[PDB]
């Protein structure tokens, strides 16, 4: 009827939610994880360095085989890198050079790409012609593309620069399901291991758990006080990390929907661009704006190690499904593999 | 050692050569960024260049390729995609001089100019200011005074004085006076002049960049 009642009802509901959260919060994860020995210092060496990009790199993804990875840069080129041999498997010339996101299909047959253009272009790699073409153009969005991650050979979940997230069908090329819960720009996107739920981060300093099939979100977390810049699901699938310009990493679980730990320090004052877990999830790796990368313990909140091989902002960070190595991309136009 | 991977290495070398050629071509190409409020003014500016998302325009002048990127239609928070324009040779800012009589619009344009000028990402890139609607501005000045949106304004009600005051107000917003230069200009109906001024500004900024690369600047 009027805001004077609906807003008050929403405020009372938020009050109830916060009261329930406080009641459920009995013991923090920090003091319950003191019984396990610290991981200790971790030293990682740059076994392989990939060069050939001539512009700032913004996103990269690891394939299912944990050997081939796709990288995107502002020069308008996608390079399929053979990490084992540093070979250039493919070079896709992008129609629009304004690209800041990319993805690799689980089957390895298609690779997604997008950016300031409103299209999450899909390219076919295993075609008989031997050349890479555009399988389809998904131009159903309004704002700038932020991240679209493959769900299957025919389904892809897309997050754009507007307040709405959408699910696309490759064969049909139409909006299968659109999510409008977010009230601000959407930046980060990650998928659960079971490919049934996904969490999208937005500039409203909140993260929402969305249902792929249901269509409506089930949880909302507002722990952060700044725009949500990065997000990644925990391997177990019951929790997910988060990076933000606040310069801290917050771990939220799906079941208790609390804020478990905050990874922060006085030295770090800049934002976090990308975050991802290891195979076991014990080590949390986050990319920072300064010329280095940091490894955070998922249970102790200690600086396990520093990866200072880059000289510019780190824009992406991915860990293989196998987990034998970690690839760190930055604005140096180079990709470095650490393990 | 390798038996079949040698062909893959040769293919990678060919791809690297193609990438190097494309990068050289891109470096030869000059990048320009278009910013400002009002679709009509930006449309007029782009149409004055003689040969959805971002609209990209390609044109050549004096054997120099020019790339112009349109971001007005993006309709997104600038704080998350303005860093992609780090390597832009120059930024063109277009404002309608008649916006002062429409609803406050001049204040919004000034705020946008201040935000862009003081952005950490554009601490070195030059900004070119294009003052649109010269005849319309003169008619509005002869009809309505400029003091409506400029309480501090105190001077003769003349087109030249009002234009000078507007230019001075726009320039003072540049905090990085030493590091950044503003090539303000007044748009004219006749063609071949706005493009000439853009080319001159690009030549000046390219000279600055070359001197800095050498070490003198």
């Amino acid at each position, epitope marked *: 009827s009027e805001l004077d009642q609906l807003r008050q009802e929403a405020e009372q509901l938020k009050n109830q939610i916060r009261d329930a959260r406080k009641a459920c919060a009995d013991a923090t994860l920090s003091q319950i994880t003191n019984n396990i020995d610290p991981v200790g210092r971790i030293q990682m060496r740059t076994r392989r360095t990939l060069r050939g990009h001539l512009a700032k790199i913004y996103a990269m993804h690891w394939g299912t085989d944990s*050997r*081939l990875l796709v990288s995107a840069s502002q020069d308008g080129k996608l390079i399929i890198w*053979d990490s084992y041999t540093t*070979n250039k*498997v*493919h070079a896709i010339p992008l129609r629009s050079s304004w690209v800041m996101t990319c993805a690799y299909a689980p089957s*390895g047959n298609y690779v997604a790409c997008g950016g300031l253009d409103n299209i999450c272009s899909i390219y076919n790699l*295993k075609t*008989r*012609e*031997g*050349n890479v073409r555009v399988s389809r153009e998904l131009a159903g969005h309004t704002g700038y593309l932020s991240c679209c991650r493959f769900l299957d050979d025919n389904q892809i979940v897309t997050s754009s620069g507007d307040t709405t997230c959408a699910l696309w069908d490759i064969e049909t090329g139409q909006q299968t399901t659109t999510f409008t819960g977010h009230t601000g720009d959407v930046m980060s996107l990650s998928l659960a291991p079971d490919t049934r739920l996904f969490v999208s981060g937005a500039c409203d300093a909140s993260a929402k758990l969305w249902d792929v099939r249901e269509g409506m979100c089930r949880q909302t977390f507002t722990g952060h006080e700044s725009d949500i810049n990065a997000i990644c699901f925990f391997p177990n699938g019951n929790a997910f990390a988060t990076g933000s310009d606040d310069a801290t990493c917050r771990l939220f679980d799906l079941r208790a929907d609390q804020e478990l730990m905050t990874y922060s320090h006085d030295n770090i004052i800049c934002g976090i661009t990308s975050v991802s877990f290891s195979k076991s999830g014990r080590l949390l790796l986050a990319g920072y704006d300064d010329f280095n990368c940091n490894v955070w313990d998922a249970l102790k909140a200690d600086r396990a190690g520093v990866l200072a091989g880059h000289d510019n902002r780190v824009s992406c960070l991915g860990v293989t499904d196998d987990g034998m190595a970690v690839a760190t991309g930055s604005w140096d136009s180079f990709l470095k593999i650490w393990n | *050692l390798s*038996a*079949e*991977d*040698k*062909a*893959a290495v*040769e*293919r990678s070398k*060919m791809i690297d050569r193609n990438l190097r050629e494309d990068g050289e071509k891109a470096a030869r190409e000059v990048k320009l960024l278009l910013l400002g409020a009002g679709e009509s003014g930006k449309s007029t500016i782009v149409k004055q260049m003689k040969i959805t998302g971002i609209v990209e325009t390609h044109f050549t002048f004096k054997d120099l390729h020019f790339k112009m990127f349109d971001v007005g239609a993006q309709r997104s928070e600038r704080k998350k995609w303005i860093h992609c324009f780090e390597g832009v040779t120059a930024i063109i800012f277009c404002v309608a001089l008649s916006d002062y009589d429409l609803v406050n619009r001049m204040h919004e344009s000034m705020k946008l100019f201040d935000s862009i000028c003081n952005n950490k990402w554009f601490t070195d890139t030059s900004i070119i200011l294009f003052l649109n609607k010269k005849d319309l501005f003169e008619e509005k000045i002869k009809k309505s005074p400029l003091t409506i949106c400029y309480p501090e304004y105190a001077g003769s009600n003349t087109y030249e004085e009002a234009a000078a005051y507007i230019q001075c107000q726009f320039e003072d917003l540049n905090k990085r006076k030493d590091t950044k230069e503003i090539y303000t200009h007044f748009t004219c109906s006749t063609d071949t002049k706005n493009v000439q001024f853009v080319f001159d500004a690009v030549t000046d900024v390219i000279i600055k960049n070359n001197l800095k690369d050498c070490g003198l600047f």
Partner: single-chain antibody
Amino acid sequence: VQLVESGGGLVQPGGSRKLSCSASGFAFSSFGMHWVRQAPEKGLEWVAYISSGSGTIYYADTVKGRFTISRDDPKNTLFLQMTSLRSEDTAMYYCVRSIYYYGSSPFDFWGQGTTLTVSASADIVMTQATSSVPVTPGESVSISCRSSKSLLHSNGNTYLYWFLQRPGQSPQLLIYRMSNLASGVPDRFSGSGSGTAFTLTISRLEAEDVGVYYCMQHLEYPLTFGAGTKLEL
């Protein structure tokens, strides 16, 4: 995808002919090319190869120097200039496409080929166990072969390929690296090996599987073929 070849006919001994092939439906520039000849009674034999970048041109020991191969990328055609032909040079030549990258399927497509009649060591051999095996529809048959040198490279990839040549048509690739099936190959086909002995199993035999089965080795470049096992229905 088509590969039309021309330049056959009766050739006097000691003469020179310019074989030409036209490539359409695929990126000729990005794909390497191989030339394979078939004796009237014997199996196929590799002749020459040219890479995508027109480099690393390799020849068989029996045509080294005598034969030269060139390609025209803008023209989208392949050429094979052969000079000083001898009596044994007569054979049915084929044009073969190939690409090389992780997960690639070289020798996937074979040209139809044209007839060519002439008026009258240190290589890996493929010792095929059997030359003819009797088969019936709905049965399972096993084809085995032996290689002088183990094809298991240090990278863990075994360089073995299988080809099916139905009568009246060019051969087609069946399995590459004895662990992956080419496009259009029915899933019933399966192959396995221990790095030195290879066995090919064809379960649920069908009428269209009749023909003769050939093998490959790709560790050393002087590629050699197998004797060939004939399947009679």
